Amino acid sequence: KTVVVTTILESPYVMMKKNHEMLEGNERYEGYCVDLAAEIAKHCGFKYKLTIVGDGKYGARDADTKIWNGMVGELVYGKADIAIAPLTITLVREEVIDFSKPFMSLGISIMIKKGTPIESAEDLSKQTEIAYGTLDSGSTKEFFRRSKIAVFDKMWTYMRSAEPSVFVRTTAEGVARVRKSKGKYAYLLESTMNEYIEQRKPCDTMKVGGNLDSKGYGIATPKGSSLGNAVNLAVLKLNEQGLLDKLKNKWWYDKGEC
Amino acid sequence: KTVVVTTILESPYVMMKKNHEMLEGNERYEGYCVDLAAEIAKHCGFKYKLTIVGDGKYGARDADTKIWNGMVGELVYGKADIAIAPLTITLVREEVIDFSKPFMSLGISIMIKKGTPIESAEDLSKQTEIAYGTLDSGSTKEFFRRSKIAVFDKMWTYMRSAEPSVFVRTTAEGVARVRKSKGKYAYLLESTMNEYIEQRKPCDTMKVGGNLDSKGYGIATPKGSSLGNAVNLAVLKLNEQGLLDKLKNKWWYDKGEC
Ligand SMILES: [Zn+2]
Ligand SMILES: [Zn+2]
Ligand SMILES: [Zn+2]
Numbered sequence: 001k002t003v004v005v006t007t008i009l010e011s012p013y014v015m016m017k018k019n020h021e022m023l024e025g026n027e028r029y030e031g032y033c034v035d036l037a038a039e040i041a042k043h044c045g046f047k048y049k050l051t052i053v054g055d056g057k058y059g060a061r062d063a064d065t066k067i068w069n070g071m072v073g074e075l076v077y078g079k080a081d082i083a084i085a086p087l088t089i090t091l092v093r094e095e096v097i098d099f100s101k102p103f104m105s106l107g108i109s110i111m112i113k114k115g116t117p118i119e120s121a122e123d124l125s126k127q128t129e130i131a132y133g134t135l136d137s138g139s140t141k142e143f144f145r146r147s148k149i150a151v152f153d154k155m156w157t158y159m160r161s162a163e164p165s166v167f168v169r170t171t172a173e174g175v176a177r178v179r180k181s182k183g184k185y186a187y188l189l190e191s192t193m194n195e196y197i198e199q200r201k202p203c204d205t206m207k208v209g210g211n212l213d214s215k216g217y218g219i220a221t222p223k224g225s226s227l228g229n230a231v232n233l234a235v236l237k238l239n240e241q242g243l244l245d246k247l248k249n250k251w252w253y254d255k256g257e258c
Numbered sequence: 259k260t261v262v263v264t265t266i267l268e269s270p271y272v273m274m275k276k277n278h279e280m281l282e283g284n285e286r287y288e289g290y291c292v293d294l295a296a297e298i299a300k301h302c303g304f305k306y307k308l309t310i311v312g313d314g315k316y317g318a319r320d321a322d323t324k325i326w327n328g329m330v331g332e333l334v335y336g337k338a339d340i341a342i343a344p345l346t347i348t349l350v351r352e353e354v355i356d357f358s359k360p361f362m363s364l365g366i367s368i369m370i371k372k373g374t375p376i377e378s379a380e381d382l383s384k385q386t387e388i389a390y391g392t393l394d395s396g397s398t399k400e401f402f403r404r405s406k407i408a409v410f411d412k413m414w415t416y417m418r419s420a421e422p423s424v425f426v427r428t429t430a431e432g433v434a435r436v437r438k439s440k441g442k443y444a445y446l447l448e449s450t451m452n453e454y455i456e457q458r459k460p461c462d463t464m465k466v467g468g469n470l471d472s473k474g475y476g477i478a479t480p481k482g483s484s485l486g487n488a489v490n491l492a493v494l495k496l497n498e499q500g501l502l503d504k505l506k507n508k509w510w511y512d513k514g515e516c
Contacts, residue, residue: 089359091494101347105363105472149500214363215497216474236349239473242407 003041003048003227006071006080007033008056010171012196012251013086026050032251036103037084039243040219043234044227051080056170058087060137070137072097075222082227083220086192088139090215098225099218100232103244107211108140109191111175113204116183120209124186125154132186133159133166135174140188141167143213152212178205192217199256261299261306261485264329264338265291266314268429270454270509271344284308290509294361295342297501298477301492302485309338314428316345318395328395330355333480340485341478344450346397348473356483357476358490361502365469366398367449369433371462374441378467382444383412390444391417391424393432398446399425401471410470436463450475457514 007014013033020028026037029050041048059072067073071087074080075097089099112118116130124132132155134140144156159166166185168174174187175197194207219235221228238244265272271291278286284296287308299306317330325331329345332338333355347357370376374388382390390413392398402414417424424443426432432445433455452465477493479486496502 089494091491091498094359094491094494099359101352101357101476102360102474105474143498146498147500213497213500214503216360216363218359233349233352236347236352239471240349240401240404242405242471245471 001047003046003081004079005037005048005050006053006074006083007037007050007085008053008058008071010086010193012255014050014052032247033084033086035247035250036219036238036244039238040084040231040234043237044230046227048082053085057137058085058135058139059093060142061092068096071220075220078222081221081225082231086190086217087220088190088215089218090139090142092142093139093220096223098221098223098228100220100228100235102216102218103235103239104192104217104248105214106190106192106217107213107215108143108188109194109211110208111178111187111189111194111197111205112208113178113181113183113185114206116186118186118208121155121212122151125151125158128158130184130186131162131166131181132188133162133168133174134188135171136167136169139215140190144188175205188212196252199253199258201257203258259305261304261339262337263295263306263308264311264332264341265295265308265343266311266316266329268344268451270513272308272310290505291342291344293505293508294496294502297496298342298489298492301495302488304485306340315395316343316393316397317351318400319350326354329478333478336480339479339483340489344448344475345478346448346473347476348397348400350400351397351478354481355478356481356486357478358486358493360474360476361493361497362450362475362506363472364448364450364474365471366401366446367452367469368466369436369445369447369452369455369463370466371436371439371441371443372464374444376444376466379413379470380409381467383409383416386416388442388444389420389424389439390446391420391426391432392446393429394425394427397473398448402446433463446470454510457510457516459515461516 012031014029014031016028017030053071055069057070059070061068068076071083072093075083118124144152147153171193177185178187191211198206219231270289272287272289275288311329313327315328317328319326326334329341330351333341402410405411429451435443436445449469455463456465477489
């Protein structure tokens with residue numbers, strides 16, 4: 001049977017092709033994860049259908065209902081068989097779903113509009129003229145919410161109460177906000193995305209400072225899935241074969257416009 | 259009852275305390291992995307005994323013998339219950355043992371004696387005056403032996419047939435070889451070790467070029483071990499709390515000698 005793959009529209013991982021309207025099924029999309037999905041399906045020998053997560057979220061647990069949303073939720077509730085996307089491996093998620101060994105290593109980073117007086121997280125936490133936030137329902141927000149280290153704790157105190165909200169529904173929303181904020185907004189996102197955007201027109205943003213942490217993205221499957229073991233070994237094989245590095249260069253810098 | 263931990267004497271992961279002779283059991287050792295072992299044990303709730311792998315190797319399968327050596331072997335044959343060391347997560351190993359999500363991210367790198375006319379792997383591959391090799395029975399050697407990309411394949415072709423042998427039994431042996439060869443030997447080792455040595459007197463070595471690949475170290479347990487699940491969650495928990503980053507700073511830079 002065809003494996004239902006849940007993913008998210010997030011460049012350069014998954015994007016609709018220029019001529020998607022005249023295309024069908026998986027042919028409508030392109031990106032790092034689209035290529036990854038094809039490679040995995042081939043090595044594990046299965047047919048699949050790419051589907052875009054309904055609520056457009058990565059995955060967080062509602063504190064009140066305890067119900068998971070996003071791709072994590074689609075896996076938890078059996079709406080999808082596997083998630084192939086820039087989904088971060090975290091403790092709370094690992095408790096409800098399975099992750100393969102990472103196919104990409106990254107960390108939380110700072111995105112600024114070129115020229116803003118900020119070079120590090122400590123710099124952001126020591127000022128108020130420049131607002132900053134993170135994506136909603138994700139691992140980055142959880143990071144600051146659950147951080148006991150001085151700098152990040154203070155940043156969270158400011159962000160969780162900030163009015164208007166400094167949080168955004170999608171990476172694209174955060175990037176747009178930085179660009180149109182005349183430098184009065186900094187966005188906290190994973191280095192992978194920061195580095196990608198930094199290489200795209202109008203080439204008006206840049207990553208500053210070192211990453212705040214070190215983690216990875218993993219292919220996720222529901223607990224007790226029969227694809228879990230194989231997919232995990234497939235990821236390792238692809239990394240060692242050099243495919244993952246090949247794909248990283250293909251979608252990040254070979255297509256860079258800055 | 260008491261969990262037997264296999265590890266390896268590799269600075270700054272595990273080292274004998276100056277006064278180990280007058281100490282007992284686990285107190286005889288110090289290092290990044292010693293600190294990590296204590297934390298993993300505390301969080302998983304078990305007592306443990308640190309033991310140094312008999313053959314001083316990380317782990318590889320003998321071609322014809324088909325027997326696994328090193329720490330991997332101690333786990334495969336039931337001599338140890340868990341391995342806590344800078345053991346690389348690889349496909350061939352994950353096929354016989356379990357690995358937690360990575361506790362450290364790294365990649366193969368190049369170590370040169372300062373002043374050596376080498377800036378990358380391509381540079382090494384295009385010349386012959388400077389010999390270069392890797393560690394034995396490990397993931398680095400296997401990386402080159404299996405590589406299908408031009409540059410690395412060329413490097414392997416040279417290394418495998420070079421005489422005298424360009425390979426070494428221990429990291430320390432490779433570092434000394436670099437330090438004593440007057441720039442005529444470059445050593446290929448993981449970035450973590452390269453970065454550490456670069457901060458050690460006589461401060462005569464340096465890491466050059468970008469990493470050749472991207473992977474990580476994981477805590478290993480025998481396949482089907484009852485400790486696997488908890489250890490994995492412990493690693494994620496500890497990484498998210500910043501312990502891992504704190505530990506690397508403690509053993510790498512806080513104690514830097516350069
Ligand atoms: Zn392939
Ligand atoms: Zn609610
Ligand atoms: Zn602890």
